[PDB]
Amino acid sequence: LSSSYVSDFPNQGRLQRVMVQADGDARMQPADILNLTVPNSSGIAVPLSS
Amino acid sequence: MGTLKDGFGIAVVPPPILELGNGSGLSINLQDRNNTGHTALLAKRNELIQ
Numbered sequence: 001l002s003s004s005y006v007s008d009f010p011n012q013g014r015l016q017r018v019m020v021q022a023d024g025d026a027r028m029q030p031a032d033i034l035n036l037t038v039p040n041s042s043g044i045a046v047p048l049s050s
Numbered sequence: 051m052g053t054l055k056d057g058f059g060i061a062v063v064p065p066p067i068l069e070l071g072n073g074s075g076l077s078i079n080l081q082d083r084n085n086t087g088h089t090a091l092l093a094k095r096n097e098l099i100q
Contacts, residue, residue: 013085 001027 003021010016026032037045065072080098082091 001032 001022003019006018006020008015009018034047034049036048038048040046078098080091080095
């Protein structure tokens, strides 16, 4: 939910930015931090609560 | 103009101070405030020339 800036793109003769973020309902409660999984370099979920 | 069948190649005596012009110094800069492209601006420049 940190709103990383990727690159630029042309629009109407100017160069505007492209911003990638999550949607609305995924960053409203702190419970999303509770089940925020990690890739674990193998595919196992490994939730953040442990 | 005689023995140089090529581009036009004009020869002119330069003015001593360029910022003061040479008599008539009308310079027009046709802009495009909506970014409609380049061919439309060239068509408007040709219409203004005509």
